[PDB]
Structure formats: C-alpha cells, structure tokens
Amino acid sequence: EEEIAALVIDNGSGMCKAGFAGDDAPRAVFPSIVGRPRHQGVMVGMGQKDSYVGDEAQSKRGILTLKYPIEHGIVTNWDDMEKIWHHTFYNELRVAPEEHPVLLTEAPLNPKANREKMTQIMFETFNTPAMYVAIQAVLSLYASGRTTGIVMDSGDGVTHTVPIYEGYALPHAILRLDLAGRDLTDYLMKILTERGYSFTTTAEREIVRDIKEKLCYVALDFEQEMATAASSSSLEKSYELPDGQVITIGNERFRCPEALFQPSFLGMESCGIHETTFNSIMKCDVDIRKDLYANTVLSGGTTMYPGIADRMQKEITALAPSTMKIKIIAPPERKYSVWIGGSILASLSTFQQMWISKQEYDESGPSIVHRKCF
Amino acid sequence: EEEIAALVIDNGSGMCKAGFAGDDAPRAVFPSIVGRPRHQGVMVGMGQKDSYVGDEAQSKRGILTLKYPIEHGIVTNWDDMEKIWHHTFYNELRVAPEEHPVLLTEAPLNPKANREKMTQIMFETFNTPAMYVAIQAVLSLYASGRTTGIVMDSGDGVTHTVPIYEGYALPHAILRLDLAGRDLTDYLMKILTERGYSFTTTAEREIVRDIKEKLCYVALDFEQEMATAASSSSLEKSYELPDGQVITIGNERFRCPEALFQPSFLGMESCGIHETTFNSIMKCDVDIRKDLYANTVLSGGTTMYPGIADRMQKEITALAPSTMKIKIIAPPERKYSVWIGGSILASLSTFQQMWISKQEYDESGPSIVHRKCF
Amino acid sequence: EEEIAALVIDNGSGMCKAGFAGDDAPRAVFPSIVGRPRHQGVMVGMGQKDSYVGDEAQSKRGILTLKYPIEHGIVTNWDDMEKIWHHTFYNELRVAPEEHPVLLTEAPLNPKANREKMTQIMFETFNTPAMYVAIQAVLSLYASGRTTGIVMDSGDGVTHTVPIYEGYALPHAILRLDLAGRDLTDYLMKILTERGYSFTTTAEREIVRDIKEKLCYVALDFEQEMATAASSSSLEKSYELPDGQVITIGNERFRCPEALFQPSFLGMESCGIHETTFNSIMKCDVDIRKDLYANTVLSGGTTMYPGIADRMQKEITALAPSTMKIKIIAPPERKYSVWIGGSILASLSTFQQMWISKQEYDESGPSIVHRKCF
Amino acid sequence: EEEIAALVIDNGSGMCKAGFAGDDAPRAVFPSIVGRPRHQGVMVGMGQKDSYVGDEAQSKRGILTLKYPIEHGIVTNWDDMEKIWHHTFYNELRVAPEEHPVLLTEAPLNPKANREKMTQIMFETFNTPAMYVAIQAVLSLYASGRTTGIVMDSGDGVTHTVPIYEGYALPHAILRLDLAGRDLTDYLMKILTERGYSFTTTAEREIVRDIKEKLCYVALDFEQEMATAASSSSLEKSYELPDGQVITIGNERFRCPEALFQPSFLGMESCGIHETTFNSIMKCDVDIRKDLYANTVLSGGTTMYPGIADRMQKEITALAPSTMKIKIIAPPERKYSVWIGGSILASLSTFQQMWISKQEYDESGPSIVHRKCF
Ligand SMILES: Nc1ncnc2c1ncn2[C@@H]1O[C@H](COP(=O)(O)OP(=O)(O)O)[C@@H](O)[C@H]1O
Ligand SMILES: Nc1ncnc2c1ncn2[C@@H]1O[C@H](COP(=O)(O)OP(=O)(O)O)[C@@H](O)[C@H]1O
Ligand SMILES: Nc1ncnc2c1ncn2[C@@H]1O[C@H](COP(=O)(O)OP(=O)(O)O)[C@@H](O)[C@H]1O
Ligand SMILES: Nc1ncnc2c1ncn2[C@@H]1O[C@H](COP(=O)(O)OP(=O)(O)O)[C@@H](O)[C@H]1O
Ligand SMILES: [Mg+2]
Ligand SMILES: [Mg+2]
Ligand SMILES: [Mg+2]
Ligand SMILES: [Mg+2]
C-alpha cells in the first residue's frame, strides 16, 4: 500500500551529511563534534545539560572542549560516535531506523577491524533491516554520469585516487596520502603567529578554520606572486574577529594552500597532489593511459579553492607527453558529489539484490561484510 | 527462377575471411581471437558482457586476456572455436546457414582427427545442406588462371609447398615447415629488448605485431646492409606508441624478416624458405623440372614484405643450373589469393557433383570425408 | 717479486659483496644505498657530512632519504653509482685498483647500453689492467661442482633461469620475470595496513623488510593453512619495533611468500616460479629433458624461505610425467652461491687467456665487450 | 702356432662391423655416424671435443647434428669417411693395420670411380700389406655352405640379387633397386603425423628408427588385416618415449613394411621385392630354373621382420608354375650372414694367391683393382 526509501549517510571525517534517496541535495548537514563542560556552574535554576552534540556545541563553544570522534578516517571513540548517529536519526531526520535500509561510505585501505564494528552497531543497537558499505571515490563517478576516468578524493582526513577504465576497477593502482584539510589548518595557525596573532585553544581553532575557507586561494605561479606581494600591497585583505578586532593577512593568503603541492613544508616527505595522480596512471596498462588522461574528476571539500583547476592542468602537462590533451573536469557542485552518487546508486533497479539481510548476520555476521562487499 | 550461392570461409590460423561466391573480395575480415575479463568490476549500472569475440576484443584489449583458438593449423579449443563460427554466420554476414552450402580450407599433412570433428560440428549444430574441404595451396593456383607451377603458401601458422605439373598433383613431393609469422613476432619481441623496450603482456603483443608489418623489409644483400647501417644513420625510422612515446629502431628493421631464410637464428635446424622450394622440385621427374622453374607462385600474408621477390630470384639462380630462366610470379593481390580461388572453384559448372550431401552423412558420416575428399 | 689476485664484485641489485679470489666467503658485505640530509641543522661545532654511503646510512636513517641506485637490474643513476664503487675499493677492502683485475656479474637479457658504460667507468676512472663480465646464473653452477642442470636465480630485482646440458648452454631457452623481493616487500606493506599499522616513509620500509626475513615461511598446502589459522591461534607470533611497541601478525606470515607461486595477487599476469621452470625445460630437445629433471639448482637470497624446497617438488611432480624422479638441490649456503662460483672461475688455470686487456680498449673499447664476452 | 690374423670389415651403408678371421661373430659393431656441435658453449673448465664418432655421438645426440658419410652405397664425404676407419682400427680393435691384410665388401653395379679411391686411401694413409674387394651377395652364400641358389641382399641403402648355378655366376642377370630401410624410415615419419606426433629433427629420426624395428611386422594377407584392425582394437600396442610420454600405434604397425612389396606407396614405379626375384630367375637358361627355385637365400638387416618368410612363399607360388616346390631358406642368424662368409673366405687355403700386393700397386695401382678383382 505504501513505499519505502533508503537513507544515505556520507559520514566522512569532519562533517556528516544525511538525507533521503531520490533527492538532489542532503536534508541535514552539521559538523560532527562532541563537547563537554569544563566548569562547575553556580546557577541552580537552569536546565544544564551534560553533553552537546552538533550545531548546539558550535553555538556555546566558549565554555566547552570540542573533541572529534574520527581522526584520519579511523574512528577512535565509540561511546561518542554512537551519540552522533543517535542525533542524526532522531533529532534531524525524524525517522525511526527500523524499516528503512541504511547506506554508508568508507575510505579505501582502512583496517577491516573498523568495518566489523560498524556492522555490530547498526545490527544490534538500531536493528536496521539492511545495510551496505561502499568506497567513497567510486560513488563520486556516478554523479558525473561517466564510467571512465580517475577520481581524486580529498576530504578532511584522507586523500586517495582510484582509476576505473570501463566498468572495471584496478585494485593494485590505489594510492593514499595522510594529508588533508586538518593538516592545513594546523599549518595556518603556525604561520599566523608571524604577525602577532596567537590562537591556542581548541575553541579558537574553529575561528582559524573559518578564515581558511574565506580568504585563501591557489596561485597560478608561486614564485611570481611572492615578488609581487613583497613590493606592492594590493593583495592584502581585512577580516573581523567575533570580538570586534580587525586583522590583516598579506602573503599568507596563498602560502597555506600551496602546501598541497609541496608537502615538504610540513616536514613530511611525499609526492604532491599532482604527482600522485601521475604515478597512479602509470601503474595501469599501456592502452588505458589515453582515456584516463582525458577524464580527471575532482571531489571533496578541500578541492573548492578558487583557481585550483588551472594549476593542476599546468602541472600534469609538463609531466605527460605533449601529444595528448589534458582535461580537468571540476563540476560546480563537487562539494556534494559523493552524496549525490549515493542517492543514484541506492535507487537503481538492479542494486536491490546486493543488500545484507538480517538473516545473513545471524550465521557469520561480523565476517560477512568482508566477502559480500568485496 | 531463384539460385542459391555458396559461402567461402578461408579459416586459416590467425585471421578469418568470409564472403559470398561470385565476388572478387571478401565481405567480412576480422582477427580470430577470444577475450575474457580478468577483474571483478564495481559498476552496477552497466551491461557487462562475459566474452568478447572479434573486432570488439581488439577495442577493449586493456582489461582482457586474448587467446588464439588455433595454433599451428591444429585447433585445440572447441568451445571457443564454436563461438568464432557463430559470430561469422550471424553478426557479420547476416545469413542463416540452412540453405547455403559451405566450403572450407585446410592445410596438408594434418591429423585426420581434425577433419572428422569439422564434419560433426557443421552437420549437427548448424545442419548445413552440403560442405567440402580443400587444400589451401591448390586453391591459390585457380586465382592465377594457370595449371602449371609450384605454389608457396606461408600464412601465420604453417608454410607448405605442392607441385602441380598439368592437371595432376604429385602427393609425394609435399613439404611442410613449422615456421611462420607467429615465430617472427616472438623473435622481434626478444630482440626489441636490446634498446630498453620490454613488452610482456599478451595485450602488448598486438602492438609489436603492428610494428612488424609497418616498418620491416627484406634486404637484398644481408652482409652489406649491416656494414652500411652501423656507420651511418639513414636507415633509422621512428614510430609512435598509443601511449604517446616515440621509439626508434635501427638495424632491427631487416633482422626479423631475415629469419625466414636462416632458421638457425631461432634455434631450429631446417632449410630456409628458398631451399625448401629447391628440394621440392628435385623430388619430381626429370621432364617436369623445366616448366616448374619458369612458374613459381607466392601467396599468404607473410610474403607481403617489400623486396622479397628480388631476393628469392637471386637465391634460386645460384642453386639451379644457369641454362634455364627463373621467374617469380608475385601478383599484387597475393594476400587474398587463397580466398579468390575458392570463389571461382565454387562457381564452376562441373563442380556441383562433388558436394557431400546430408544423406551421405547418415551412413558413415564421420568417415566419409576421408574417401570422398581424397 | 710479489703475486696478484683478482677481486670479485657480485654487484647485484640491492646488496653488494666483495672479496679476494681463493677464499670461501666474501670479506665485505653491506647494503647499497645512498642517503642525503633533508633538514638544515643548527649546530655549528659538528663535522656534518653531505652524503652517507653504505652501513653509515643504515645507522642514522631517521633524518635521511634513502635512494637505490639500481632498479630492476638496470642502473639509472651514475653519479650515485660511482660513489658505491669508490667506497668498496678504498674504505672496505683497502686495496688500490691499479694492479688487480676486476670481475663483475650481470643479469641476462639486459640492454647492452648498460655493459658499454660499465667498460667506460672502470677503464677511465680507475684504469684497471683487465676486467670481465659474466652471467650471474652460470657462475652459480660452478659452486655446485656440476655441469648439468637448470639453475634458478632469484635475487632482489630479477628472476631468470638458464639450462645447461653438458658444457654447452642453450640461449633460446632463457626466460626472465620482473618479480623479486622488492615486489614482495611492497606487497607486505599493503596488507600490513589490515591490522592498523601503517608504514609510509622510505626509512620505515627498511623496518618492514626486516620483518619479512624473520617471520615468514612458505606453506606446504595453502588452502589447508587458512582453515587452520582462522580457527585456532597457534600460528601467531610477536615482534618488537625499535620504538618499543609490540606487534602481532597472524595469517600474514605465509600470505606474502605465496605471491611467488601466484603472481595474480600483485595484479600481474604471468606464470608462477614453478611454472617458469617447466616451460624452460620444455623448450629444450627431447633427449635432454631426463637429465635436467634430476638436477635443479636454486640460488639467491629470495630462495632462503624455510620449506620452499618441499613445495617446489610437489608442484613439478604434478606437471611432469610420473615415470621420472624429481630432485631439488638446495645447498645450505645458497645465499653466497653466486659469489663462490666467481672465486673458483677466476682461479682456473685456463681462464687467464680471456681477460680484456688495456691495449684492446684503445681501438674499439666501448664495443669490444659485445664480441669478446659473447 | 702362428698365423696372420685377417681383419674383415663389412662396411655397408648404415652400420659398420669389424672383427678377426676365424671367429663366428664380429667383435665391434657400432653405427657409422659423425656429429658436430651446433652451439658455442659457456663453460671453460671442460674438455670439449670438436667431433664425435660412433657410439659416443649416439649418447649426446641432443646437441649435435648427425650426418651419414655413405648414401645409397656411394660414399660422398671422404674427410668424414676417413674418420670412421681411423676409429675402427685404433679405438675398437686396438690393432695397428701395418701387418694384417684387410678385406672389404662393396655392392654391385657401382661406379668404379669408387673402388679406385678405396685403393688410394688404404695403400697411402695406412699402408696395408694387402687388400681385396668382394661382392656382398656372393659372400652370403659361403655362410650357408651351399653353391646353388639366388641370394637376396637387402641392407640399408641397396637391394640386389645375383644367381649362381654351380661354381659360376651369371653377370647379365644381376638386378638392383634403390629401395631399402632408409626409405621406410622416412615413410614411417610421414604417416606418423596422422595421430599428432611430429618428428622433424635429425636427432628425432633415430627415435623413429627404433620404433620401426621393435613393433613392426609383415601381414600374411594385407587386405584382411585392415578390415580386422578397423573394427576391433586387439592389434594396438604402446611405446614409451625417452621423455616419458606414451604413444599408441594402430594399423601403422604393418603399413610401413608393406611398402617393400608395393613400391607405389612411395611414388616410385618399380617391381616389388618378390617380383624382382622372379624376373632375375627368368633371365637364366631353361635348365637352371629348377634348382634356383628350390634354393632361395635371404640376408640383410631389413629381412628380419617377423613373418616375412611365409609371405614370400605365397607370392612366388602364384607366379611360378604349380609343378615345382618353392622353399625359402631363412637362417636365424641372417643379420650377420655377410660378415661370417667373409671370415670363411679369408681362411681358405687356396685364397692366399689372390691378394693385391704392395708391389703391384707401384706400377698401375689405381687401375689394378679393375682387372685383378674382375
Ligand atoms: N570553500 C572552501 N574552501 C576551502 N576549504 C574548504 C571550503 N569548504 C570546505 N572546505 C574544507 O572542507 C573540509 C571538509 O571537507 P568535506 O568534504 O566537507 O569533508 P567530508 O568529505 O568528510 O564531508 C573542511 O575541513 C574545510 O577546511
Ligand atoms: N603488411 C604486412 N606486412 C607484414 N606482415 C603482414 C602484413 N599483413 C599481414 N601480415 C602477416 O600475415 C599474417 C596473417 O596471415 P593470414 O592471411 O591470416 O594467414 P591465414 O589466413 O592462413 O591464417 C599476420 O600474422 C601478419 O603477421
Ligand atoms: N632469511 C631470509 N628470508 C627471506 N628472505 C630473505 C632472507 N635473506 C635474504 N632474503 C631476501 O633476499 C634478498 C637479497 O638478495 P641478494 O642475495 O642480494 O640478490 P642479489 O645479490 O642478486 O641482489 C633480499 O631482498 C631479501 O628480501
Ligand atoms: N629386428 C628388425 N626388424 C626390422 N628391421 C630391422 C631389424 N633389425 C635390423 N633391421 C634393419 O636393418 C638395417 C641394418 O642393416 P645392416 O645389417 O646394417 O646392413 P649393412 O650392413 O649392409 O649396412 C637397419 O636399418 C634396420 O632398419
Ligand atoms: Mg567527501
Ligand atoms: Mg592463407
Ligand atoms: Mg644474485
Ligand atoms: Mg649387409
């Protein structure tokens, strides 16, 4: 008589997005933090709570300590992590998770001690009829409507690439880097002490993160800008703190995003973001390199810096031979690319035969996810 | 009022040609390979097939393993071989094989365990009204319009000669060599590692084969060219890979085709291609040697190397006595010589009495081919 | 008045061994790496060097980047490679290379652009009175004191086989595979992320390599062990990192060495180590296959895994016909088999007439090595 | 208590037999082949010879090319042929040929350019005191102890008959055929490709020859056996190759020896072995035909096929008139019949006056053999 749908929860590491299948945008988006008070309080006639989750913690962050339940794509705290899902199902979507299947996302090359515990939580605490776990990068390709190209995923905790030629994925060419937005925010705080501003409290870290995504951009030619910025002052901008003071940042605007292409700034030795894509392609066969060069897809929040498309094209061209053409495909909605691909996949007619049923969990539940989602 | 035609299928070993009788060119030509995927695939919304046959496999050869159903003129796989014929009858010629007789070709000195199974397949699976099997080399003589001369057949798996004086064939002078294009391609890969290029995958073998038939030629004087090529550099050519890189080959241009005249390079002890023709002629009677010397006919794909006619004339002259004249007849269309001869033979007025009827198969079908085609 | 000896330098790809002729063991063994600092340093009163070569780099590897001058048996860097030889001649053997002939080793089927540059370095920079280059696998047979059998060489960069019947070698049966210890170490790092341990730095790669040669073994029956290891826990061992933490590895003990017999794990399509030996033997004549089956000789560092002799016998028996007996000869000192054979060869009375003299280099020096060592 | 031993060699074409006079069996028997290496060799510490003669070549035939110095009873190579005699005199009989007369055998109707060169070799290189040349077939009659009958000689290169009535020989009735064991071996290789086994190398020809003299027999009624062999399978036998594989031959057991009675199989037009004997007898006078019919003597290696005596009796009876009785005399030791007759002849008291002395050679040596041995 009625019909059902499927929830898509792109958990990620740093921001949680939830919604219903069939739509083109998430319904609820909120940062994933857990805060606790650190004082005693003197007032008696107040309904003082014990823990704040989600947007509420972002409001009263002057008297709390904020802790992130997920670090580098691997969840470390489970008591706090249970609270995040409990908030999403009840106070945001207002849907009881007992008749609607759930779909999750998870980064590649992670311990399968993680995927085991995800099965235990949702099949015991909430008792969902079905669930499935998919790679984040693969879902990004569904949004573009294409089945050929190498996808670059760069969220807040991890950065990985996976090539797909045509309906097949090569598992031996997957790479991974532990360099993402969290490392850039800590780097910006280190170099913002240059002008006399010092932020040390975890509450003040949120203020620094806001500056990063409001005034930073990637320079087309790094060396030329430093000469220009040193002489004149046309690149200086002013920002206003919540306290009322005004701060001005000069050459720091493009020094922070430049760390993506030169990881040597942070003290880590590794290839840049542009060189990782080149190495991934060269690990494929000789007849696939032509199509992959003409289809490169970007995704993730970190990629949203203005002018990042032009710089990536220049870097790849100098490395690849001059005969073929290099094209970077950067859709304007790349921030929600992962979530949209999840909605399309869960609505396919032929995908309904791949769910993990409640009956299957009864026999070898903690180990079924390894083989059925391989 | 309505007449039926006859299909000619020069199966060969390495390339299949099909067409209708009465024409001067085959209608469908495609390599005979069968490919299967070797990965798992992650995409759901794709019509992923299980096996690719013919030109389709040559397109997506970056994710497949290619296997040849025929090796050295003897078919080894029958499940894959059935697929090749099924593709030819339906998806290329678009004719139902239930009212048109079929004609095949087959190399001499092969096991008649082979010709038995060919009868079983076409008289049970497709139920053709009639069929006939003929020697490949004999059909080549019909195209030239002559009935006197020794024909040299050199395809991709076998190389054989058969002399015919006048309307009669001598069965005791037929020779055979297991040296053909497949051995040359493997030899080229072995010596192409000299300059740093290494091809090992079966998909990369197709790239090496393309180079062979685009840049190789036979030298008139082998020893003189090596002295010339070593000093100067006017014999160097450049080729472009599908990946975009450029490769240059020097003295390797004529080292590969030279293996035909000196089989000692490959580690096999045997006479060269030129010496085999001499030995075949000397096995005939004393009054036939004059006419055979003045009519030598070449055929097959391997013979298409430029400058092979001049070298063969020089080799034979040094062996035969100086009195008679040696002439090598190399028509410009020798690549399709076998097929054209099949079309003419099937259209003869007096050949219609030699078909193998469906009634004859009922009594001693698996054994009738031995006596009726003798 | 005095007498001369000959130095033997089994260069290999990954470890260098040097010594004097007539002995039974190398005098100096050290890894072949070159390291450079990646920081600036603040201390003034220190004798800070610019580059570290050999065992010194292995000590202070916490602040250096290690680079291998040789990859896959083909040297890529010559400035760094010159440093390795300079260290060996002076700081380890303490002998001036101006009166003692030198002997080298080199893998088969390599570009002879390589052997040309080896001649240039030793005849100009050091000016050695004589030198000679020999195949690695052939030298291994001298140590066994036998002249009949197929030798399997598996070092760190290459894996090749060459058959020798009796005093003669067949050059058309030599095979080669690009699968060696370096590929196994990278594979172990990929699957060691399963339990939460992540090594990414080139300095941390040396730690992973140490685990491989201290806790890994080859299982007699691969499928049976997985069933046993999954249920019980008697196959688990513990290892201690330099930092102090303890790590435990379960079924990963035998999953890494199993990649030798099934190259499909790494994404490469090729025959296993056992199947390559079978194909090499079948390329010989019909009367040689009996003696080669009864004499198989192993060598190289990779072959030192416990229990590899028993597994190889089982694999060959299933392929070869049951009549003959299969014997695998694995001497306990197979790690130094190549070097010992070099010492014996350089001490033979009849070998002194095959050196390349300084006079010969003056005429056609860069090209004499091709013909005199053929 | 003293005599001059005689060395008696029945050179033949395909096998050499040597021994001393007065014995009943040859002392040394070995195939007459000469082999040379066709590779280069890498080993230094080996006593590698340049040419192998006799039984040694039969051992290491996997790396050599075997050449027969004698073809069709006419020696073609003299440098190789000198080596065969040098081996026999020194390394097998261990007797210096300077005091013992030598006796040879030679087929009839051969060029007396041959017998001239035999005189030159033994009277210059070895300087034997005396020598004599005799017809092979005549010597066969001495072994039987009879002086009336027609002898059939069929070795490996030639087949000839000569009638002798009583103490006299008729020179105008001698016949000759170029059909012997060598033609049968080549025929067997041609029809053994029927079942999929292909032997092409000269080393593999020796394996085919071994099968011929171990599993072949002559059928009493050719047409009846084919009907029997086609229906049932009681005539199939299995043979084991040196490699270990097993092969089975069906009706090929008696198809090869049948070519002797029907030369039309090989493409040669001639009378059979049975018809040649009939034609030879009919060339004699009318009063001799009765005794010759009752005494037919066989000899040679080719005649050793089982059941050849019964078939020959049936063939002759149908041709000759029914009045007289036909008897075929086939002694069990017919393989050494020629040699034994040589031993008896050289020991006769009245034969010592027919030697060719060293003094006679000085005047007209190259021409004395024509008249003194007429
Ligand atoms: N406009 C922007 N410019 C730069 N960085 C941005 C921008 N918007 C978001 N980010 C970065 O995106 C990071 C999170 O990316 P996101 O894709 O939301 O993570 P996840 O993949 O876990 O959902 C933040 O930590 C922030 O630094
Ligand atoms: N232009 C060319 N130059 C050199 N070789 C060629 C050329 N065209 C075809 N060949 C060779 O001819 C072979 C094809 O022979 P084919 O006609 O298929 O014989 P068959 O039909 O008996 O199998 C291929 O293996 C290829 O190497
Ligand atoms: N005990 C061991 N167990 C497993 N592997 C080993 C052991 N000892 C050495 N190896 C492997 O052998 C390799 C060394 O090979 P080596 O003898 O240097 O070859 P080459 O001299 O040709 O370079 C190392 O990479 C290492 O992985
Ligand atoms: N048992 C046998 N069955 C069949 N053929 C045989 C047998 N023994 C020997 N032969 C044939 O006889 C030949 C040997 O003849 P041989 O006595 O050497 O003649 P000659 O001495 O004149 O050379 C061989 O080629 C072999 O084929
Ligand atoms: Mg994301
Ligand atoms: Mg052809
Ligand atoms: Mg080694
Ligand atoms: Mg004889």
Author numbering:
A (entry chain A), B (entry chain C), C (entry chain B), D (entry chain D): 1 to 374
Task: Please give me the paper's original passages concerning this structure.
Actin isoforms are among the most ubiquitous and abundant structural proteins that facilitate the functional organization of the cytoplasm of eukaryotic cells. Actin isoforms share high sequence identity at the protein level (~93–99%) and the propensity to self-assemble into helical, polarized filaments (F-actin) from monomers. To determine the structural characteristics and differences between actin isoforms, we solved the high-resolution structures of single-isotype skeletal muscle α-actin (3.37 Å), cardiac muscle α-actin (3.07 Å), ß-actin (2.99 Å), and γ-actin (3.38 Å) in the filamentous state using cryo-EM. Our 2.99–3.38 Å resolution structures of filamentous actin isoforms show that the N-termini of bare muscle and nonmuscle actins have different orientations that contribute to distinct binding interfaces for myosin motors and likely other ABPs.
Specifically, we used our previously established Pick-ya actin method to recombinantly produce human ß-actin and γ-actin in an engineered Pichia pastoris strain that expresses the human N-acetyl transferase NAA80 and histidine methyl transferase SETD3 to ensure uniform Nt-acetylation and methylation of H72/H73, a conserved PTM profile of vertebrate actins. The structures show local resolutions ranging from 2.1 to 3.5 Å for skeletal muscle α-actin, 1.9–3.3 Å for cardiac muscle α-actin, 1.5–3.0 Å for ß-actin, and 2.1–4.4 Å for γ-actin. For ß-actin and γ-actin, we could resolve the entire N-terminus starting from amino acids D1 and E1, respectively. Specifically, the presence of resolvable density allowed us to model the entire N-terminus including the Nt-acetylated D1 (D1Ac) and the Nt-acetylated E1 (E1Ac) in the cryo-EM reconstructions of β- and γ-actin. The acetylation site on the N-terminus is exposed on the filament surface and adds an additional negative charge to the already negatively charged N-terminus. The presence of both key PTMs in our cryo-EM reconstructions emphasizes that our recombinant human actins represent bona fide post-translationally processed, mature nonmuscle actins. Superimposition of bare γ-actin with γ-actin/NM2C complex shows the subtle inward movement of the D-loop with a Cα RMSD of ~1.25 Å in the myosin-bound state, suggesting that myosin-binding induces subtle changes in the barbed end groove that do not change the separation between SD1/SD3 and SD2/SD4. The negatively charged N-termini of bare ß-actin and γ-actin are near loop-2, a major element of the actomyosin interface that is rich in positively charged amino acids and variable in length. Furthermore, we observed a cluster of positively charged amino acids (R661, R663, and R664) in loop-2 of NM2C that may interact with either the acetylated N-terminus of ß-actin (D1Ac, D2, and D3) or the acetylated N-terminus of γ-actin (E1Ac, E2, and E3) to stabilize the interface.
